[PDB]
Amino acid sequence: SIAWYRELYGTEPNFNYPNGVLVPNHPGYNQTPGGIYLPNVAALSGAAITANRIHYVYFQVAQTFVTDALVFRVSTAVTGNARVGLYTVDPSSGFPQFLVTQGSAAALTGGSTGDRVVLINRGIVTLPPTWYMTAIVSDVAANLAGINGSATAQYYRQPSIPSGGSGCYTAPFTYGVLPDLAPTPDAVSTTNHPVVGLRTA
Amino acid sequence: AITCTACTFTMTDAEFAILNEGVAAPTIDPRGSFAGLQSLSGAPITASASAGTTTVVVAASNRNDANIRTLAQRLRRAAQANRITFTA
Amino acid sequence: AITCTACTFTMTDAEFAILNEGVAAPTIDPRGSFAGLQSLSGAPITASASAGTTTVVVAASNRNDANIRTLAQRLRRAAQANRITFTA
């Protein structure tokens, strides 16, 4: 019985022919400043990433999201520097194409265990609902939160079915400022799935 | 004997979907922009996709003057109508 | 982003000589069938010959629709005039 809908809302519900066509993929984003929204990850534990390689992780912004920083977790202190950024995604291939934004300065991967917050060079960015890809690069084998798992293996093209799950995309890129055109990923990490969260503005 | 060994065009999957009436790469829509060519042996046009890029070629035994000319003309008209840059 | 990545034609040395006013492959004759095309970044037509086979291609940045169409039309007309089979 749909009688409760009119009592709660005052209007009749709108059933469209494909059931679920209007349903967003996310319940909603709380735009209270200081909060962090994470991507779809299987396990938020520490693993050491390969240096001088860009790690690409999918992030589904299912509704308009106003962000002001990129937050990533360091599990164990490794002396080094890291750069983070956000890229668009080509729907035809799932590859990152254009750099939405990146941190104004490199973040330290050592000193303490916790969260590193990097202010984006555009200040405040309003992302319309689409798939984006967070890219993280480091000059050292930084130990970051997020490992491989079976819950995210559906988003990445696998060369073979893995037993312990798959991680993120990896591309060869000397550490530095992230380029406007994302280098094409050439391998799927079998153990690393770094998480870069968006801080609400 | 004069032989055409290659008549190949490269597109993005989005542009191909626009001109193939939304259908994927390996299928040629009869009401699309790649249908209506002179078939000599089989399907005159074959398309494939890789890494978001669509390759459209004329089949091995269908590469006569008419098919090449008509494919070029259709690509011209399609790019001009849809404001798609023809980089070549 | 529509681009032509390969527009190649294969002939014999004798047939190229017939269509190039009796000149060998390295040089396109200005009075031949491969001269008079639209030049966008240099010589639109380049010919090479390793064996008796000769390969005639459109240049890298000259592969627009018009060059392909006109090359196909000229090859057809020269093949019909000279009774050279266009086996493609």
Short mmCIF file of C-alpha atoms in Angstrom, two decimals:
data_model
loop_
_atom_site.label_atom_id
_atom_site.label_comp_id
_atom_site.label_asym_id
_atom_site.label_seq_id
_atom_site.Cartn_x
_atom_site.Cartn_y
_atom_site.Cartn_z
CA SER A 1 0.00 0.00 0.00
CA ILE A 2 1.35 3.39 -1.08
CA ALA A 3 -1.11 5.36 1.09
CA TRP A 4 1.67 6.42 3.48
CA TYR A 5 3.46 8.33 0.72
CA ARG A 6 0.70 10.93 0.36
CA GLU A 7 0.45 11.35 4.14
CA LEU A 8 4.20 11.92 4.49
CA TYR A 9 4.73 14.00 1.34
CA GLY A 10 1.36 15.32 0.16
CA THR A 11 1.80 14.02 -3.40
CA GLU A 12 1.43 10.68 -5.13
CA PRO A 13 4.60 8.66 -5.80
CA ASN A 14 6.06 8.75 -9.31
CA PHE A 15 6.54 5.27 -10.76
CA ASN A 16 8.49 5.35 -14.02
CA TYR A 17 8.60 2.41 -16.41
CA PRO A 18 12.16 1.20 -15.61
CA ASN A 19 11.96 0.58 -11.86
CA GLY A 20 15.02 2.22 -10.34
CA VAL A 21 15.87 4.52 -13.23
CA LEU A 22 15.70 7.60 -10.99
CA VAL A 23 17.36 6.01 -7.93
CA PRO A 24 20.77 7.59 -7.27
CA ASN A 25 23.71 5.32 -6.56
CA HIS A 26 24.40 7.12 -3.26
CA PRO A 27 21.88 8.06 -0.55
CA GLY A 28 23.30 11.57 -0.31
CA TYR A 29 26.32 13.59 0.76
CA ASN A 30 26.36 15.58 4.00
CA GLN A 31 27.97 18.89 3.04
CA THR A 32 28.93 19.83 6.60
CA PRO A 33 32.58 20.95 6.38
CA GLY A 34 35.23 18.70 7.88
CA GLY A 35 33.76 15.35 6.81
CA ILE A 36 35.48 12.76 4.62
CA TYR A 37 33.74 10.53 2.07
CA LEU A 38 35.64 7.40 1.08
CA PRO A 39 35.51 5.43 -2.18
CA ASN A 40 34.40 1.82 -2.44
CA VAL A 41 37.23 -0.14 -0.79
CA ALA A 42 37.44 -3.71 0.49
CA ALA A 43 39.83 -3.32 3.44
CA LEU A 44 41.20 -0.14 5.03
CA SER A 45 44.49 -1.60 6.28
CA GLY A 46 48.07 -0.59 5.57
CA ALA A 47 50.17 -1.74 2.63
CA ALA A 48 53.36 -0.44 1.03
CA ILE A 49 52.90 1.03 -2.45
CA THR A 50 55.44 0.98 -5.27
CA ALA A 51 57.38 4.22 -5.58
CA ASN A 52 57.34 6.33 -8.75
CA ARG A 53 54.00 4.86 -9.83
CA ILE A 54 50.60 6.53 -10.04
CA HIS A 55 47.88 4.54 -8.28
CA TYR A 56 44.42 5.09 -9.77
CA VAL A 57 41.33 4.30 -7.68
CA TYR A 58 37.71 4.70 -8.78
CA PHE A 59 35.44 7.15 -6.94
CA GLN A 60 31.73 7.31 -7.77
CA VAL A 61 30.33 10.79 -7.14
CA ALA A 62 26.70 9.78 -7.57
CA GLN A 63 25.39 13.25 -6.68
CA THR A 64 26.79 16.77 -6.87
CA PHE A 65 29.61 17.01 -4.33
CA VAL A 66 31.40 20.15 -3.14
CA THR A 67 34.92 19.28 -1.98
CA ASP A 68 37.91 21.28 -0.78
CA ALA A 69 40.67 18.77 0.03
CA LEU A 70 42.01 15.27 -0.61
CA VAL A 71 42.57 13.10 2.47
CA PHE A 72 44.68 9.95 2.54
CA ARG A 73 45.69 7.75 5.47
CA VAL A 74 49.26 6.79 6.41
CA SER A 75 49.46 3.58 8.45
CA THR A 76 53.20 3.49 9.20
CA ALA A 77 55.65 6.38 8.97
CA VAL A 78 57.91 6.18 5.91
CA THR A 79 60.04 9.27 5.28
CA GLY A 80 59.02 10.64 1.90
CA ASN A 81 56.58 12.78 -0.05
CA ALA A 82 53.30 12.05 -1.81
CA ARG A 83 51.14 13.88 -4.33
CA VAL A 84 47.40 13.35 -4.75
CA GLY A 85 44.95 14.38 -7.45
CA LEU A 86 41.54 13.80 -8.97
CA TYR A 87 41.00 12.91 -12.64
CA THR A 88 37.95 12.51 -14.83
CA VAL A 89 37.07 9.09 -16.26
CA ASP A 90 36.40 8.20 -19.88
CA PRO A 91 33.14 6.19 -19.85
CA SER A 92 34.11 4.37 -23.05
CA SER A 93 37.19 2.76 -21.48
CA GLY A 94 37.09 3.54 -17.74
CA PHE A 95 40.52 5.21 -18.04
CA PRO A 96 41.41 8.57 -16.50
CA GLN A 97 41.70 11.32 -19.10
CA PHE A 98 41.75 14.84 -17.63
CA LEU A 99 43.03 16.17 -14.30
CA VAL A 100 40.16 17.68 -12.33
CA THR A 101 42.51 18.97 -9.64
CA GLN A 102 45.50 18.16 -7.47
CA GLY A 103 46.99 19.16 -4.14
CA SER A 104 48.73 22.51 -3.91
CA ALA A 105 51.73 20.98 -2.12
CA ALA A 106 53.12 17.49 -1.57
CA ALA A 107 52.14 15.66 1.61
CA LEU A 108 54.50 13.97 4.06
CA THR A 109 54.26 10.18 4.28
CA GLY A 110 56.16 9.94 7.57
CA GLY A 111 56.29 11.29 11.09
CA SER A 112 53.08 9.82 12.48
CA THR A 113 50.20 7.47 11.72
CA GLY A 114 47.00 9.20 10.71
CA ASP A 115 45.29 11.31 8.04
CA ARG A 116 47.08 13.70 5.69
CA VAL A 117 44.86 16.44 4.25
CA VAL A 118 46.03 18.14 1.05
CA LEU A 119 44.34 21.34 -0.08
CA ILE A 120 43.47 21.27 -3.77
CA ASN A 121 44.94 23.97 -6.00
CA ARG A 122 41.47 25.13 -7.11
CA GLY A 123 40.36 25.75 -3.51
CA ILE A 124 36.77 24.52 -3.78
CA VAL A 125 35.62 22.17 -6.55
CA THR A 126 32.01 21.24 -7.33
CA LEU A 127 31.97 17.77 -8.88
CA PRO A 128 28.86 16.91 -10.93
CA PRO A 129 27.70 13.30 -10.55
CA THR A 130 30.00 10.99 -12.53
CA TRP A 131 32.88 8.56 -11.99
CA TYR A 132 36.21 10.18 -11.10
CA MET A 133 39.54 8.58 -10.27
CA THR A 134 41.84 9.50 -7.39
CA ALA A 135 45.52 9.28 -8.31
CA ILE A 136 48.30 9.06 -5.73
CA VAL A 137 52.04 9.06 -6.42
CA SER A 138 55.05 8.85 -4.11
CA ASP A 139 58.83 8.92 -4.37
CA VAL A 140 59.17 6.24 -1.66
CA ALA A 141 57.41 2.99 -0.79
CA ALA A 142 54.84 4.82 1.31
CA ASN A 143 52.67 2.64 3.55
CA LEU A 144 49.08 3.73 2.97
CA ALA A 145 45.66 2.46 3.99
CA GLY A 146 43.80 0.19 1.59
CA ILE A 147 44.69 -3.26 0.27
CA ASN A 148 43.35 -5.58 -2.41
CA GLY A 149 39.98 -7.26 -2.07
CA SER A 150 37.18 -9.01 -3.91
CA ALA A 151 34.63 -6.20 -3.50
CA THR A 152 36.45 -3.92 -5.97
CA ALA A 153 37.65 -6.47 -8.54
CA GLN A 154 34.59 -5.73 -10.70
CA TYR A 155 35.80 -2.21 -11.59
CA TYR A 156 39.21 -3.19 -13.01
CA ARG A 157 40.08 -5.19 -16.11
CA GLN A 158 41.84 -8.29 -14.83
CA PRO A 159 44.41 -10.32 -16.78
CA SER A 160 43.24 -13.38 -14.85
CA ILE A 161 40.89 -14.23 -12.00
CA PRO A 162 42.82 -13.63 -8.75
CA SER A 163 42.51 -15.59 -5.53
CA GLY A 164 43.20 -12.83 -2.99
CA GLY A 165 41.47 -10.11 -4.97
CA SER A 166 42.77 -7.18 -6.98
CA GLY A 167 43.81 -3.64 -6.12
CA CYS A 168 43.88 -0.45 -8.14
CA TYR A 169 45.34 0.64 -11.46
CA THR A 170 49.05 1.43 -11.61
CA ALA A 171 50.90 3.52 -14.18
CA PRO A 172 54.63 4.29 -14.47
CA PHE A 173 55.26 7.95 -13.65
CA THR A 174 58.30 9.62 -12.11
CA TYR A 175 57.31 11.38 -8.89
CA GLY A 176 56.33 15.01 -9.34
CA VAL A 177 53.42 17.25 -10.21
CA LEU A 178 50.63 15.19 -11.73
CA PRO A 179 50.10 15.82 -15.47
CA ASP A 180 46.96 17.20 -17.07
CA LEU A 181 46.65 14.06 -19.22
CA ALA A 182 46.63 10.94 -17.08
CA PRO A 183 49.22 8.34 -18.15
CA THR A 184 47.48 5.19 -19.32
CA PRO A 185 47.45 2.46 -16.64
CA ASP A 186 49.38 -0.64 -17.66
CA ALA A 187 48.87 -3.04 -14.73
CA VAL A 188 46.43 -3.86 -11.95
CA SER A 189 48.02 -3.86 -8.50
CA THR A 190 47.65 -7.20 -6.73
CA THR A 191 48.24 -5.85 -3.21
CA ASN A 192 47.79 -2.04 -3.14
CA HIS A 193 44.50 -0.10 -3.19
CA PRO A 194 45.27 3.31 -1.66
CA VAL A 195 42.29 5.37 -0.50
CA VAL A 196 42.02 9.10 -1.16
CA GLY A 197 38.95 10.68 0.41
CA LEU A 198 37.24 13.94 -0.46
CA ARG A 199 36.74 16.48 2.32
CA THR A 200 33.40 18.27 2.12
CA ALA A 201 33.40 22.05 1.73
CA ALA B 1 47.00 -5.42 -60.16
CA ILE B 2 46.16 -2.32 -58.11
CA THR B 3 45.21 -3.39 -54.59
CA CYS B 4 44.10 -1.38 -51.56
CA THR B 5 45.88 -3.01 -48.63
CA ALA B 6 44.56 -0.65 -45.93
CA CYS B 7 41.55 1.66 -45.57
CA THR B 8 41.48 2.26 -41.82
CA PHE B 9 39.86 4.97 -39.69
CA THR B 10 40.26 5.62 -35.97
CA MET B 11 37.59 7.13 -33.73
CA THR B 12 36.56 7.28 -30.11
CA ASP B 13 33.86 4.92 -28.88
CA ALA B 14 31.62 7.91 -28.12
CA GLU B 15 31.82 9.23 -31.69
CA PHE B 16 31.26 5.76 -33.13
CA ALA B 17 28.24 5.27 -30.88
CA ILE B 18 26.92 8.62 -32.10
CA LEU B 19 27.28 7.54 -35.72
CA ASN B 20 26.38 3.86 -35.23
CA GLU B 21 23.09 4.98 -33.61
CA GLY B 22 24.23 4.07 -30.10
CA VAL B 23 25.21 0.49 -30.93
CA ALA B 24 28.52 -0.97 -29.77
CA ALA B 25 31.66 -1.38 -31.87
CA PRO B 26 31.39 -4.81 -33.58
CA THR B 27 27.82 -4.19 -34.81
CA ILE B 28 26.89 -2.08 -37.84
CA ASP B 29 23.41 -0.59 -37.58
CA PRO B 30 21.51 -0.74 -40.92
CA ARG B 31 20.10 2.77 -40.24
CA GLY B 32 23.56 4.01 -39.21
CA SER B 33 26.27 5.91 -41.05
CA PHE B 34 28.32 2.80 -41.89
CA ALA B 35 25.56 0.84 -43.66
CA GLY B 36 24.45 0.94 -47.28
CA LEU B 37 27.80 0.24 -48.91
CA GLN B 38 28.35 -2.09 -51.85
CA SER B 39 28.88 -5.60 -50.49
CA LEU B 40 31.14 -7.73 -52.69
CA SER B 41 31.92 -10.71 -50.44
CA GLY B 42 30.45 -10.13 -46.98
CA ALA B 43 30.02 -7.14 -44.69
CA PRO B 44 31.88 -4.24 -46.35
CA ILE B 45 32.71 -2.56 -43.02
CA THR B 46 34.09 -4.13 -39.85
CA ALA B 47 34.64 -2.27 -36.58
CA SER B 48 36.49 -3.18 -33.39
CA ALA B 49 37.16 -1.51 -30.04
CA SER B 50 40.23 -1.31 -27.81
CA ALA B 51 41.02 1.03 -24.90
CA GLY B 52 38.16 3.36 -25.76
CA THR B 53 39.22 3.65 -29.41
CA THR B 54 37.19 2.25 -32.31
CA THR B 55 38.92 1.07 -35.49
CA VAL B 56 36.70 0.98 -38.59
CA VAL B 57 38.05 -0.79 -41.67
CA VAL B 58 36.79 -1.94 -45.05
CA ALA B 59 36.71 -5.71 -45.36
CA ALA B 60 39.40 -7.65 -47.20
CA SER B 61 37.48 -8.31 -50.43
CA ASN B 62 35.31 -5.16 -50.32
CA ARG B 63 38.01 -2.49 -50.79
CA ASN B 64 37.00 -1.22 -54.22
CA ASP B 65 36.95 2.44 -55.24
CA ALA B 66 33.24 2.87 -54.50
CA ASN B 67 33.43 1.60 -50.91
CA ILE B 68 36.47 3.74 -50.05
CA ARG B 69 34.98 6.86 -51.64
CA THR B 70 31.60 6.35 -49.98
CA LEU B 71 33.13 5.67 -46.56
CA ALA B 72 35.19 8.86 -46.83
CA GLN B 73 32.13 10.85 -47.91
CA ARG B 74 30.00 9.45 -45.08
CA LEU B 75 32.68 10.23 -42.51
CA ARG B 76 32.96 13.78 -43.87
CA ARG B 77 29.22 14.41 -43.73
CA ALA B 78 28.89 12.77 -40.30
CA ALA B 79 31.76 14.79 -38.82
CA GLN B 80 30.48 18.06 -40.29
CA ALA B 81 26.89 17.46 -39.16
CA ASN B 82 27.87 16.39 -35.63
CA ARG B 83 30.69 18.95 -35.14
CA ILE B 84 33.23 16.13 -34.80
CA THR B 85 36.77 17.19 -35.65
CA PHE B 86 38.33 15.24 -38.52
CA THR B 87 41.91 15.51 -37.34
CA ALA B 88 43.55 13.91 -40.39
CA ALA C 1 38.60 12.77 -33.43
CA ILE C 2 38.04 10.91 -36.69
CA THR C 3 41.41 10.19 -38.31
CA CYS C 4 42.61 7.98 -41.15
CA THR C 5 45.52 5.86 -39.94
CA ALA C 6 46.28 3.97 -43.17
CA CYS C 7 45.33 4.52 -46.82
CA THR C 8 47.76 2.35 -48.80
CA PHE C 9 47.67 0.96 -52.33
CA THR C 10 49.72 -1.87 -53.82
CA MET C 11 50.76 -1.99 -57.48
CA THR C 12 53.48 -3.53 -59.61
CA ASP C 13 56.46 -1.53 -60.81
CA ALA C 14 55.24 -1.65 -64.42
CA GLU C 15 51.74 -0.46 -63.51
CA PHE C 16 53.13 2.36 -61.37
CA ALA C 17 55.30 3.37 -64.32
CA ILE C 18 52.18 3.44 -66.50
CA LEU C 19 50.38 5.62 -63.94
CA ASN C 20 53.44 7.76 -63.11
CA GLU C 21 54.21 8.78 -66.71
CA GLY C 22 57.04 6.25 -66.98
CA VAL C 23 58.90 7.38 -63.84
CA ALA C 24 60.16 5.01 -61.14
CA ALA C 25 58.65 5.03 -57.62
CA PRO C 26 60.87 7.52 -55.62
CA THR C 27 59.49 10.48 -57.67
CA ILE C 28 55.85 11.47 -58.25
CA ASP C 29 55.64 12.99 -61.72
CA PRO C 30 53.76 16.33 -61.82
CA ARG C 31 51.94 15.23 -65.01
CA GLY C 32 50.92 11.82 -63.64
CA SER C 33 47.85 10.46 -61.89
CA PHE C 34 49.28 11.02 -58.39
CA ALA C 35 49.88 14.76 -58.86
CA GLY C 36 47.44 17.59 -58.26
CA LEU C 37 46.06 16.53 -54.87
CA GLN C 38 45.50 18.88 -51.93
CA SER C 39 48.73 19.57 -50.04
CA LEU C 40 48.26 20.25 -46.33
CA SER C 41 51.65 19.40 -44.80
CA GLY C 42 53.92 18.58 -47.76
CA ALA C 43 53.72 16.03 -50.55
CA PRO C 44 50.31 14.34 -50.20
CA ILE C 45 51.36 11.14 -52.02
CA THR C 46 54.50 9.12 -51.28
CA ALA C 47 55.54 6.03 -53.24
CA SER C 48 58.12 3.38 -52.35
CA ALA C 49 59.35 0.19 -54.00
CA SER C 50 61.45 -2.59 -52.45
CA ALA C 51 60.55 -5.57 -54.64
CA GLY C 52 58.75 -5.26 -57.98
CA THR C 53 55.80 -4.31 -55.78
CA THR C 54 55.21 -0.58 -55.31
CA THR C 55 53.35 0.93 -52.35
CA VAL C 56 51.59 4.28 -52.75
CA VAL C 57 50.38 5.96 -49.56
CA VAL C 58 48.87 9.28 -48.53
CA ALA C 59 51.16 11.31 -46.30
CA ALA C 60 50.79 11.41 -42.52
CA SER C 61 49.11 14.83 -42.25
CA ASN C 62 47.56 14.84 -45.75
CA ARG C 63 45.06 12.01 -45.15
CA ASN C 64 41.87 14.04 -45.29
CA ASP C 65 38.64 12.91 -46.92
CA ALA C 66 39.30 14.75 -50.19
CA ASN C 67 42.75 13.26 -50.77
CA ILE C 68 41.45 9.73 -50.17
CA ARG C 69 38.43 10.27 -52.42
CA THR C 70 40.46 11.83 -55.23
CA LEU C 71 43.19 9.18 -55.04
CA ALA C 72 40.57 6.43 -55.27
CA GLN C 73 38.84 8.15 -58.20
CA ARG C 74 42.11 8.70 -60.08
CA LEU C 75 43.20 5.11 -59.49
CA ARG C 76 39.85 3.86 -60.80
CA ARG C 77 39.97 6.07 -63.89
CA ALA C 78 43.59 5.17 -64.67
CA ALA C 79 42.90 1.46 -64.19
CA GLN C 80 39.89 1.60 -66.51
CA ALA C 81 41.75 3.63 -69.13
CA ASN C 82 44.84 1.39 -69.09
CA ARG C 83 42.97 -1.94 -68.74
CA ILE C 84 44.74 -2.56 -65.43
CA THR C 85 42.69 -4.79 -63.16
CA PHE C 86 41.78 -3.20 -59.81
CA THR C 87 41.56 -6.51 -57.98
CA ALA C 88 40.70 -5.00 -54.59
#
